[PDB]
Every structure is written in C-alpha cells, then in structure tokens.
Design an enzyme around this catalytic site. Structure first.
Site, PDB file in Angstrom:
ATOM      1  N   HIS A   9       0.781  -1.230   0.000  1.00 48.62           N
ATOM      2  CA  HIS A   9       0.000   0.000   0.000  1.00 48.62           C
ATOM      3  C   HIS A   9       0.819   1.289   0.000  1.00 48.62           C
ATOM      4  O   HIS A   9       0.238   2.354  -0.119  1.00 48.62           O
ATOM      5  CB  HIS A   9      -0.977   0.025   1.177  1.00 48.62           C
ATOM      6  CG  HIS A   9      -2.322   0.617   0.837  1.00 48.62           C
ATOM      7  ND1 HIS A   9      -3.455   0.313   1.541  1.00 48.62           N
ATOM      8  CD2 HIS A   9      -2.676   1.473  -0.149  1.00 48.62           C
ATOM      9  CE1 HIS A   9      -4.479   0.972   1.004  1.00 48.62           C
ATOM     10  NE2 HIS A   9      -4.044   1.667  -0.016  1.00 48.62           N
ATOM     11  N   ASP A  18     -10.013  -0.449   3.928  1.00 53.59           N
ATOM     12  CA  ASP A  18      -8.834  -1.019   4.588  1.00 53.59           C
ATOM     13  C   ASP A  18      -9.190  -1.451   5.999  1.00 53.59           C
ATOM     14  O   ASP A  18     -10.018  -0.815   6.650  1.00 53.59           O
ATOM     15  CB  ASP A  18      -7.733   0.062   4.636  1.00 53.59           C
ATOM     16  CG  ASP A  18      -6.309  -0.514   4.702  1.00 53.59           C
ATOM     17  OD1 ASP A  18      -6.068  -1.512   5.414  1.00 53.59           O
ATOM     18  OD2 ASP A  18      -5.424   0.051   4.025  1.00 53.59           O
ATOM     19  N   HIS A  44      -6.952  -1.132   8.069  1.00 55.53           N
ATOM     20  CA  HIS A  44      -6.009  -0.229   8.735  1.00 55.53           C
ATOM     21  C   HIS A  44      -6.107   1.192   8.213  1.00 55.53           C
ATOM     22  O   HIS A  44      -6.520   1.414   7.081  1.00 55.53           O
ATOM     23  CB  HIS A  44      -4.588  -0.707   8.471  1.00 55.53           C
ATOM     24  CG  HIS A  44      -4.387  -2.158   8.778  1.00 55.53           C
ATOM     25  ND1 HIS A  44      -4.445  -3.132   7.798  1.00 55.53           N
ATOM     26  CD2 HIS A  44      -4.110  -2.790   9.935  1.00 55.53           C
ATOM     27  CE1 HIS A  44      -4.239  -4.308   8.353  1.00 55.53           C
ATOM     28  NE2 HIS A  44      -4.036  -4.142   9.645  1.00 55.53           N
ATOM     29  N   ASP A 103      -3.454   3.301   7.916  1.00 52.11           N
ATOM     30  CA  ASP A 103      -2.279   3.629   7.112  1.00 52.11           C
ATOM     31  C   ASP A 103      -1.851   5.084   7.260  1.00 52.11           C
ATOM     32  O   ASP A 103      -1.406   5.714   6.297  1.00 52.11           O
ATOM     33  CB  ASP A 103      -2.533   3.285   5.635  1.00 52.11           C
ATOM     34  CG  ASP A 103      -2.714   1.804   5.421  1.00 52.11           C
ATOM     35  OD1 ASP A 103      -2.609   1.076   6.424  1.00 52.11           O
ATOM     36  OD2 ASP A 103      -2.935   1.364   4.272  1.00 52.11           O
ATOM     37  N   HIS A 135       4.229   1.119   4.124  1.00 50.15           N
ATOM     38  CA  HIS A 135       2.843   0.810   3.751  1.00 50.15           C
ATOM     39  C   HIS A 135       1.815   1.077   4.858  1.00 50.15           C
ATOM     40  O   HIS A 135       0.617   0.965   4.608  1.00 50.15           O
ATOM     41  CB  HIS A 135       2.678  -0.634   3.253  1.00 50.15           C
ATOM     42  CG  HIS A 135       2.691  -1.661   4.345  1.00 50.15           C
ATOM     43  ND1 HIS A 135       2.092  -2.892   4.195  1.00 50.15           N
ATOM     44  CD2 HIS A 135       3.222  -1.648   5.591  1.00 50.15           C
ATOM     45  CE1 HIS A 135       2.248  -3.595   5.303  1.00 50.15           C
ATOM     46  NE2 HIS A 135       2.936  -2.869   6.165  1.00 50.15           N
ATOM     47  N   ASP A 146      -7.462  -1.784  -0.106  1.00 49.59           N
ATOM     48  CA  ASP A 146      -6.553  -2.767   0.461  1.00 49.59           C
ATOM     49  C   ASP A 146      -7.347  -4.059   0.587  1.00 49.59           C
ATOM     50  O   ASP A 146      -8.347  -4.083   1.285  1.00 49.59           O
ATOM     51  CB  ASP A 146      -6.103  -2.290   1.853  1.00 49.59           C
ATOM     52  CG  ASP A 146      -5.020  -3.171   2.474  1.00 49.59           C
ATOM     53  OD1 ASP A 146      -4.949  -4.374   2.130  1.00 49.59           O
ATOM     54  OD2 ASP A 146      -4.254  -2.667   3.345  1.00 49.59           O
ATOM     55  N   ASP A 156      -7.009  -6.480   2.354  1.00 51.71           N
ATOM     56  CA  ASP A 156      -7.201  -6.910   3.743  1.00 51.71           C
ATOM     57  C   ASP A 156      -8.419  -6.276   4.428  1.00 51.71           C
ATOM     58  O   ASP A 156      -8.721  -6.570   5.585  1.00 51.71           O
ATOM     59  CB  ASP A 156      -5.908  -6.807   4.591  1.00 51.71           C
ATOM     60  CG  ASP A 156      -5.531  -5.373   4.971  1.00 51.71           C
ATOM     61  OD1 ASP A 156      -6.385  -4.468   4.963  1.00 51.71           O
ATOM     62  OD2 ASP A 156      -4.348  -5.148   5.310  1.00 51.71           O
ATOM     63  N   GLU A 191      -2.051  -5.075  -1.874  1.00 47.93           N
ATOM     64  CA  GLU A 191      -1.752  -6.019  -0.792  1.00 47.93           C
ATOM     65  C   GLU A 191      -2.146  -7.477  -1.025  1.00 47.93           C
ATOM     66  O   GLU A 191      -2.109  -8.281  -0.090  1.00 47.93           O
ATOM     67  CB  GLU A 191      -2.265  -5.513   0.570  1.00 47.93           C
ATOM     68  CG  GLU A 191      -1.637  -4.165   1.018  1.00 47.93           C
ATOM     69  CD  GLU A 191      -0.226  -4.295   1.579  1.00 47.93           C
ATOM     70  OE1 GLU A 191       0.282  -5.435   1.700  1.00 47.93           O
ATOM     71  OE2 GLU A 191       0.379  -3.251   1.916  1.00 47.93           O
TER      72      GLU A 191
HETATM   73  N1  LIG Z   1      -0.323   0.005  11.489  1.00 48.26           N
HETATM   74  C1  LIG Z   1       0.523  -1.151  11.168  1.00 48.26           C
HETATM   75  C2  LIG Z   1      -0.070  -2.013  10.046  1.00 48.26           C
HETATM   76  C3  LIG Z   1      -0.103  -1.351   8.687  1.00 48.26           C
HETATM   77  C4  LIG Z   1      -0.621  -2.286   7.586  1.00 48.26           C
HETATM   78  C5  LIG Z   1      -0.523  -1.544   6.250  1.00 48.26           C
HETATM   79  B1  LIG Z   1      -1.699  -1.982   5.284  1.00 48.26           B
HETATM   80  O1  LIG Z   1      -1.332  -1.290   3.950  1.00 48.26           O
HETATM   81  O2  LIG Z   1      -1.702  -3.434   4.894  1.00 48.26           O
HETATM   82  O3  LIG Z   1      -3.035  -1.342   5.517  1.00 48.26           O
HETATM   83  C6  LIG Z   1       1.882  -0.615  10.754  1.00 48.26           C
HETATM   84  O4  LIG Z   1       2.035   0.632  10.753  1.00 48.26           O
HETATM   85  O5  LIG Z   1       2.801  -1.395  10.394  1.00 48.26           O
HETATM   86  C7  LIG Z   1       0.437  -1.919  12.492  1.00 48.26           C
HETATM   87  C8  LIG Z   1       1.738  -2.216  13.241  1.00 48.26           C
HETATM   88  C9  LIG Z   1       1.675  -3.428  14.177  1.00 48.26           C
HETATM   89  C10 LIG Z   1       2.183  -4.589  13.344  1.00 48.26           C
HETATM   90  C11 LIG Z   1       0.950  -5.097  12.597  1.00 48.26           C
HETATM   91  C12 LIG Z   1      -0.223  -4.343  13.209  1.00 48.26           C
HETATM   92  C13 LIG Z   1      -0.526  -3.115  12.362  1.00 48.26           C
HETATM   93  N2  LIG Z   1       0.327  -3.945  14.497  1.00 48.26           N
HETATM   94  C14 LIG Z   1      -0.558  -3.108  15.322  1.00 48.26           C
HETATM   95  C15 LIG Z   1       0.217  -2.923  16.586  1.00 48.26           C
HETATM   96  C16 LIG Z   1       0.569  -4.044  17.323  1.00 48.26           C
HETATM   97  C17 LIG Z   1       1.298  -3.890  18.486  1.00 48.26           C
HETATM   98  C18 LIG Z   1       1.671  -2.619  18.901  1.00 48.26           C
HETATM   99 CL1  LIG Z   1       2.609  -2.495  20.423  1.00 48.26          CL
HETATM  100  C19 LIG Z   1       1.314  -1.500  18.155  1.00 48.26           C
HETATM  101 CL2  LIG Z   1       1.755   0.166  18.636  1.00 48.26          CL
HETATM  102  C20 LIG Z   1       0.587  -1.655  16.991  1.00 48.26           C
HETATM  103 MN   LIG Z   2      -3.453  -0.499   3.544  1.00 46.01          MN
HETATM  104 MN   LIG Z   3      -4.485  -2.964   5.545  1.00 46.23          MN
END
Ligand SMILES: N[C@@](CCCC[B-](O)(O)O)(C(=O)O)[C@H]1C[C@H]2CC[C@@H](C1)N2Cc1ccc(Cl)c(Cl)c1
Ligand SMILES: [Mn+2]
Ligand SMILES: [Mn+2]
Length: 306
Positions: A97, A120, A122, A124, A137, A228, A230, A273
């Site tokens: 993404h 989504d 999420h 993002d 992403h 997305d 997902d 994704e």
């Molecule tokens: N917000 C994410 C996931 C983004 C996914 C992107 B997409 O494009 O698939 O929508 C990120 O910034 O990497 C999150 C980070 C983390 C890893 C996967 C999921 C989502 N988690 C949420 C999360 C889990 C634990 C903690 Cl301690 C925190 Cl602060 C956040």
């Molecule tokens: Mn996304």
């Molecule tokens: Mn997503």
C-alpha cells in the site's frame, strides 16, 4: 469509458516477500477480459520496473527502504498522471500500500480536487514519528494529508511529494486495526471513518450514503478508491500480509464497489496487498486474486442483476 491498468509490484513498503507478485496474480484471474466485457477501452501499461537506489539505509534506524519507496512512487506518479491526463480512469495493481503515495500524488497532479475513499482494515496514517514497524505501507496517508505536514519529517527520496489531500477529503471504510497514535490523528484532525463497528450499526448502504455526502455532497469530485484487499475478512482474502479477523463480507465489498461505480465519478483505483505467496494453498491464492478482480470489475460497472 477508458481504463488504464498499471502493475506496480511494490514490496519495499513492507517486509514480507511475495506481494510484488500481486499484479500478475490479479491479471491471471482474468482482469482484462472482465473490464473489456464491461465496455472499458483498455490501455495496459504492463508491470512497471522501478529504479533501484544504492545504499538505501534505514531512515532513523527504523524506516525501511525510504529512498526506494520514494523513488518508485515518484516514477509511478509520473505514469498515473500521464494516464489520467490522457482521459483514462487509472487502475493500479499492487504491490504493497505504500504505492498509494504515488498513485494519489499522480492522480492529484491532474485532478487536484480529488477525494479519497480508503477501504482497509487499517488507517495507514502513521507518520515516521509514530510508526512502530517502520514499514511505509502503514504510513502513506501521512505524506498526503495537508493538515499533518508539520508533524511529518522529510524522508530521503520523499522531497518531491506535495501533500494533496485535505483531512475533509478522505473517508475510511473497514477499519478494525488502528494503532493508538493513528486513533489520535483521526480524532485530532476530524478525519471521518466507518470502522467495522460502524458498519455493524449502520449497514453498508448507509455507510456508502454517508461517505458520499461527506465527499461529494456539495460538488462533484473525481474519486480515488484505494482498496486494500485486507479490508475483506481473512476467510475471503487470506493471501495478504496483515490479515485481521472480522472484516468485510463479500457482499459488503461488492456493494462498496457498486456504489463507487454508481457515482459516475471514479477516476482512479488502487487494489493493493494481494500476496499470493502467503496463501497456504493455490486455492487460497486464486480466491484472493478472484476477489480482487471482482472488486475492480464492480467498481467499473459489474452488477449483480444483469
Ligand atoms: N499500522 C501497522 C499495520 C499497517 C498495515 C498496512 B496496510 O497497507 O496493509 O493497511 C503498521 O504501521 O505497520 C500496524 C503495526 C503493528 C504490526 C501489525 C499491526 C498493524 N500492528 C498493530 C500494533 C501491534 C502492536 C503494537 Cl505495540 C502496536 Cl503500537 C501496533
Ligand atoms: Mn493499507
Ligand atoms: Mn491494511
């Protein structure tokens, strides 16, 4: 009437191998014929090859591949801008993404009054200062939103980006996995969203009605649908990097796309994704790809009533 299809095999916005094969998976699921049958005149740009960046060290010991993601998006934006300027609705197949940085930037380059429907699990919308993963992403919206730029540091490879979206011009649908800083951002900047809970309460018809009232209730605007895969329940779209239980049903997804088509305003679409390598079986991979094709086709006029 005219649709451009661009394959954007981005994988460097995240850490899991295989999402670069999303575009081929979607094509093999029959995308081009489905669009043709709907009366779409097609320009296929094929799959882009992005320029690599030597020594693309982390940024700040955390943000991965910033120069590579930045440059790939710059190149992508150029292609998208050109397609939209030539009168094509632009379909970009991902890829992770982070490519929405490029598609939305490129789209906005020709259509500055665009609005965004972001579908989504999420938001993002992490910034480089709030991301816990370092994966771009999960940050693309932060680089695009005008109201956030005083909180977004300048990444190497990102200097070409000019924020092109205002907080009133994006609506999220599907949200069920939002990080605490993202929740703060959404609330503090009054960004409108319909989480899965809102869909449970309102139903998808009212969600789509309210979405369009927010975005195009006052004037017609070109719509950018960033979808997305997902957003769908993992039972329907298992081949993706960050699946979250309790997602959109098949019918809800189709309804979103149908309502997008019914506006007559769809100008660009991302379908991101799909990662066929994360499927546990060829069946899981193909169904995810078939679902992607269904979303795109419905967004361009496929109906469930003939
Ligand atoms: N917000 C994410 C996931 C983004 C996914 C992107 B997409 O494009 O698939 O929508 C990120 O910034 O990497 C999150 C980070 C983390 C890893 C996967 C999921 C989502 N988690 C949420 C999360 C889990 C634990 C903690 Cl301690 C925190 Cl602060 C956040
Ligand atoms: Mn996304
Ligand atoms: Mn997503």
């Amino acid at each position: 009437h005219s649709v451009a299809v661009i394959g954007a095999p981005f994988s460097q916005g995240q850490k899991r191998k295989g999402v670069e094969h999303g575009p081929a998976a979607i094509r093999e699921a029959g995308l081009m014929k489905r669009l043709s049958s709907l009366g779409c005149h097609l320009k296929d740009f094929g799959d882009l090859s992005f320029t690599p960046v030597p020594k693309d060290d982390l940024y700040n010991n955390l943000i991965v591949n910033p120069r590579s993601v930045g440059l790939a998006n710059q190149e992508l934006a150029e292609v998208v801008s050109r397609a939209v300027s030539d009168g094509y609705s632009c379909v970009t197949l991902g890829g992770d993404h982070s490519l929405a940085i490029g598609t939305i930037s490129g789209h906005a380059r020709h259509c500055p009054d665009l609005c965004v429907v972001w579908v989504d699990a999420h938001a993002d919308i992490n910034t480089p200062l709030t991301t816990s993963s370092g994966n771009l992403h999960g940050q693309p919206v932060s680089f695009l939103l005008r109201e956030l730029q005083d909180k977004v540091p300048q990444l190497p490879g990102f200097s070409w980006i000019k924020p092109c979206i205002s907080s009133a011009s994006i609506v999220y649908i599907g949200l069920r996995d939002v990080d605490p800083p993202e929740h703060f951002i959404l609330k503090n900047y009054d960004i409108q969203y319909f989480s899965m809970r809102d869909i449970d309460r309102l139903g998808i018809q009212k969600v789509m009605e309210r979405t369009f009232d927010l975005l195009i209730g006052k004037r017609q605007r070109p719509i950018h649908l960033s979808f997305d895969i997902d957003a769908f329940d993992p039972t329907l779209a298992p081949a993706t990097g960050t699946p979250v239980v309790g997602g959109l049903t098949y019918r809800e997804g189709m309804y979103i796309a149908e309502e997008i088509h019914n506006t007559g305003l769809l100008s660009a679409l991302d379908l991101v994704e799909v990662n066929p390598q994360l499927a546990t079986s060829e069946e899981e991979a193909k169904t995810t790809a078939n679902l992607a094709v269904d979303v795109i086709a419905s967004s361009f006029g496929q109906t469930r009533e003939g």
